Short mmCIF file of C-alpha atoms in Angstrom, two decimals:
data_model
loop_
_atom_site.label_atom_id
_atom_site.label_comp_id
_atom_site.label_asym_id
_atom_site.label_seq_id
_atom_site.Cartn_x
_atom_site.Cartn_y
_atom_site.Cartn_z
CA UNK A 1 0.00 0.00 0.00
CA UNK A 2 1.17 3.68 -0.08
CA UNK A 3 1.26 5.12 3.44
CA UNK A 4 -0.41 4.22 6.97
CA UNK A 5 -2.09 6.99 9.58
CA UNK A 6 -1.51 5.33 13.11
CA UNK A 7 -3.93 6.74 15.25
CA UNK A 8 -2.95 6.15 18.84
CA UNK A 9 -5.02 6.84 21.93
CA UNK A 10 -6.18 5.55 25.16
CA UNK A 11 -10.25 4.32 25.61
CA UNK A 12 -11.59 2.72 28.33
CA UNK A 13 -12.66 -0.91 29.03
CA UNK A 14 -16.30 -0.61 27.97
CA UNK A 15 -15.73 1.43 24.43
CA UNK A 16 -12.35 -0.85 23.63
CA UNK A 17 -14.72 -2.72 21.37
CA UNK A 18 -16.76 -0.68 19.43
CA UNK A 19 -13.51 0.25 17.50
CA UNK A 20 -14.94 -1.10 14.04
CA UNK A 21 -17.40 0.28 10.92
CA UNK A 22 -20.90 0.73 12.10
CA UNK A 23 -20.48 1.00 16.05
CA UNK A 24 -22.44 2.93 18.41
CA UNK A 25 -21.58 4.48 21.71
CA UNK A 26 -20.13 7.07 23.55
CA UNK A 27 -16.87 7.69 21.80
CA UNK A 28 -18.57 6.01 18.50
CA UNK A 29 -20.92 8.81 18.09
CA UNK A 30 -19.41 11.64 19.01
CA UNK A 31 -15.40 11.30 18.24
CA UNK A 32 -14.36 8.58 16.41
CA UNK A 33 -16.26 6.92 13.04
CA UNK A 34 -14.92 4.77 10.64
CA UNK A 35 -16.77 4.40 7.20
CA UNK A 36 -17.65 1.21 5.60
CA UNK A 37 -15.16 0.97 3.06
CA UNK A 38 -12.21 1.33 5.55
CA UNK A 39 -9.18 -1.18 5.50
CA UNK A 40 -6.62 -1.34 8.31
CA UNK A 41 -6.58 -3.83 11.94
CA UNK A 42 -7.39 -3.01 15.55
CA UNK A 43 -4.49 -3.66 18.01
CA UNK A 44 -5.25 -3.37 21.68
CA UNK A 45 -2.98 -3.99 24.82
CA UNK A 46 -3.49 -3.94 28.51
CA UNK A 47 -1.59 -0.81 30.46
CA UNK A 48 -3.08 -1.20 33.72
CA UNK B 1 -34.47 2.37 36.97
CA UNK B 2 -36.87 0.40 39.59
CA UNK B 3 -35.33 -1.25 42.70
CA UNK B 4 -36.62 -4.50 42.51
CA UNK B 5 -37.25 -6.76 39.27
CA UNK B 6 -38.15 -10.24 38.62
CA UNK B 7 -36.28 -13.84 37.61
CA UNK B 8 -35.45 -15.35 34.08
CA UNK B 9 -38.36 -17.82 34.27
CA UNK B 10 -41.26 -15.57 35.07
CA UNK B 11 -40.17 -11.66 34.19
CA UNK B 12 -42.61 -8.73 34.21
CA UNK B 13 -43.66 -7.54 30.49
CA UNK B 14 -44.33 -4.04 30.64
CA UNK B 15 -46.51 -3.15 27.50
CA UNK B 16 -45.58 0.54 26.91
CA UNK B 17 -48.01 2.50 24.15
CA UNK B 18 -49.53 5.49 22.96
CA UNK B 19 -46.49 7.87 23.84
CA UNK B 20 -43.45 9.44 22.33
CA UNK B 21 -40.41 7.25 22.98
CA UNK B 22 -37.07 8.83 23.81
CA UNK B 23 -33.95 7.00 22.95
CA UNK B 24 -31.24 9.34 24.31
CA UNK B 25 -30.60 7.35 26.87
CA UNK B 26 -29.77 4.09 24.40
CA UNK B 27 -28.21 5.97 21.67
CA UNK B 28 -26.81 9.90 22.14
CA UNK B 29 -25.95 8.35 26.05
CA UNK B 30 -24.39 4.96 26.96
CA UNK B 31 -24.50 4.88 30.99
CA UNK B 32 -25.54 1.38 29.76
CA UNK B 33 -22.68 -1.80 29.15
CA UNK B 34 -24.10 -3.44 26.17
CA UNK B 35 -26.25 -2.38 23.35
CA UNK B 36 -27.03 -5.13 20.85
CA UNK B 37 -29.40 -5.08 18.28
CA UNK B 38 -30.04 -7.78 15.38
CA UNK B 39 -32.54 -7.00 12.79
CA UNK B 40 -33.17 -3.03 13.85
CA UNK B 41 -30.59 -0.47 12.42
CA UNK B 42 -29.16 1.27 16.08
CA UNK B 43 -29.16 4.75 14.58
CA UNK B 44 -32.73 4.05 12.89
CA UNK B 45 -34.28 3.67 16.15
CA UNK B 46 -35.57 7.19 16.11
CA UNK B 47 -36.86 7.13 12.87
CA UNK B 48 -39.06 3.86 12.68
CA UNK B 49 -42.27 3.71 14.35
CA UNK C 1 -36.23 -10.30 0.83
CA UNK C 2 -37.99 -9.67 3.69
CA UNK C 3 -40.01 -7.48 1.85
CA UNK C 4 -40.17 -6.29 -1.89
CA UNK C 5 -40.28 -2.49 -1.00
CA UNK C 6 -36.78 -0.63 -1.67
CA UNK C 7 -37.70 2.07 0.32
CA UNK C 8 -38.28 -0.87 3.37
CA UNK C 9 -34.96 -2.29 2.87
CA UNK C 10 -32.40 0.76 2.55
CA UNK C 11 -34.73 2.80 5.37
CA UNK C 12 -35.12 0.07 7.61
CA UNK C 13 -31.53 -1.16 7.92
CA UNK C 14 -27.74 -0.81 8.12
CA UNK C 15 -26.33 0.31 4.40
CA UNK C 16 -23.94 -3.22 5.24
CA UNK C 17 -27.42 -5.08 5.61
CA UNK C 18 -29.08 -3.41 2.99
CA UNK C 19 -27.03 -4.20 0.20
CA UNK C 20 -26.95 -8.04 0.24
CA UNK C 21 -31.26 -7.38 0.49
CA UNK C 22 -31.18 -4.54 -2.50
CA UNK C 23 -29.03 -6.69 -4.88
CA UNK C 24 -31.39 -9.88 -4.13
CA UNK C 25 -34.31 -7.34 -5.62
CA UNK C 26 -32.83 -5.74 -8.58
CA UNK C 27 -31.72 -9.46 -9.87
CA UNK C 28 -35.06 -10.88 -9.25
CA UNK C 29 -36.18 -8.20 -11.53
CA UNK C 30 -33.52 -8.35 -13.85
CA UNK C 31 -34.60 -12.30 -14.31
CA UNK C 32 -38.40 -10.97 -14.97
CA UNK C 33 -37.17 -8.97 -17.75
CA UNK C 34 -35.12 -11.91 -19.07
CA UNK C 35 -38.15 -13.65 -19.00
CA UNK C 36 -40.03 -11.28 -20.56
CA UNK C 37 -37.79 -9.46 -23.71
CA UNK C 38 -36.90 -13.20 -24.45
CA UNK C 39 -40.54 -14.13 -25.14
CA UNK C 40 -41.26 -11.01 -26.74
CA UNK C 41 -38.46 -12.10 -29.58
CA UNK C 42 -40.26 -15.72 -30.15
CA UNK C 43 -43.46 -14.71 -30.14
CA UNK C 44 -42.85 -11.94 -32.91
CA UNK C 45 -40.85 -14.45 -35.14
CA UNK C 46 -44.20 -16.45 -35.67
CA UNK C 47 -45.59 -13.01 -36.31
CA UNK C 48 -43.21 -12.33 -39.14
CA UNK C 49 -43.20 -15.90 -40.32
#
């Protein structure tokens, strides 16, 4: 592919899984969408 | 939001009509852990009667 | 389909659900006009003959 954006934050426990196309919640509404047609992976880690 | 509710076997079905529904509370708000819906579109809830 | 209304499909679900549901609908009536523009060519040959 041409180029990557890595976007890198921190979300809590109960919104780690609505990162995905066609989610609905807290920080799905109102910050972060993803459209259908979008290609990439989720990688999540435990910082506790 | 009531204190006390009832078991899996028997349950208490609430038939709710005749009013103006409000789904702020299941869609613009989560206070709630999951939301999972199966043949009804989650942001189409307010637009379907 | 659940149902054969277009504007029940696209309105009443997610655009991922609705297009496996639209695409069932416009080939079911592409294979009526097959049907149809395919007997409309025999049937006029025996007019011509």
């Amino acid at each position: 592919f041409t180029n990557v954006y890595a976007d890198s934050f921190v979300i809590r426990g109960d919104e780690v899984r609505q990162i995905a196309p066609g989610q609905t919640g807290n920080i799905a509404d109102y910050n972060y969408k993803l459209p259908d047609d979008f290609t990439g992976c989720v990688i999540a880690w435990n910082s506790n | 939001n009531a204190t006390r509710f009832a078991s899996v076997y028997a349950w208490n079905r609430k038939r709710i009509s005749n009013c103006v529904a409000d789904y702020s509370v299941l869609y613009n708000l989560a206070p709630f852990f999951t939301f999972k819906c199966y043949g009804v579109s989650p942001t189409k809830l307010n637009d379907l009667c | 389909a659940i149902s054969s209304v277009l504007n029940d499909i696209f309105s009443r679900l997610d655009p991922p659900e609705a297009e496996v549901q639209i695409d069932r609908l416009i080939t079911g009536r592409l294979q009526s006009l097959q049907t149809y523009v395919t007997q409309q060519l025999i049937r006029a040959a025996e007019i011509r003959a």
